[PDB]
Write a protein that binds this ligand. Sequence first.
Ligand SMILES: *[C@@H]1O[C@H](CO)[C@@H](O)[C@H](O)[C@H]1NC(C)=O
Ligand SMILES: *[C@@H]1O[C@H](CO)[C@@H](O)[C@H](O)[C@H]1NC(C)=O
Ligand SMILES: *[C@@H]1O[C@H](CO)[C@@H](O)[C@H](O)[C@H]1NC(C)=O
Length: 119
Amino acid sequence: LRAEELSIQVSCRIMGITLVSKKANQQLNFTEAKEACRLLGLSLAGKDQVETALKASFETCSYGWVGDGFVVISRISPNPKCGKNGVGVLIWKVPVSRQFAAYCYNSSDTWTNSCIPEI
Ligand SMILES: *[C@@H]1O[C@H](CO)[C@@H](O)[C@H](O)[C@H]1NC(C)=O
Ligand SMILES: *[C@@H]1O[C@H](CO)[C@@H](O)[C@H](O)[C@H]1NC(C)=O
Ligand SMILES: *[C@@H]1O[C@H](CO)[C@@H](O)[C@H](O)[C@H]1NC(C)=O
């Protein structure tokens, strides 16, 4: 996996969280998801860290790997095409060979929204 084949799909990180995917037609298996975050200087987020981001209204319509070894989606408002209309951080247990996006975590972030200065 090469860094140049990655897409960063959240520029304003919410509680340290971004979503990373691959510019190509295949996405990231579990090993590749960890590598994608590592190449960016980030760790693969845990589900608990995505829940913390959801509390700050982080939302996606992509399943992505977390370090717990399954994929999650972060939902604020129900949509039938995103986590089967659920809200929450929803878990889908898939083979580690299955390709999805990756949730990466940036521990250096100290603001709730990295685009919004806070005291
Ligand atoms: C984070 O900040 C950006 C920049 O204003 C904004 O567009 C985005 O909606 C914010 N996200 C959240 C979850 O507050
Ligand atoms: C994940 O993909 C890589 C190719 O980048 C491959 O070497 C590895 O075996 C794959 N892992 C699984 C569990 O299939
Ligand atoms: C994490 O976010 C900070 C800003 O809070 C940024 O300066 C830094 O580059 C990010 N992490 C990495 C590995 O770049």
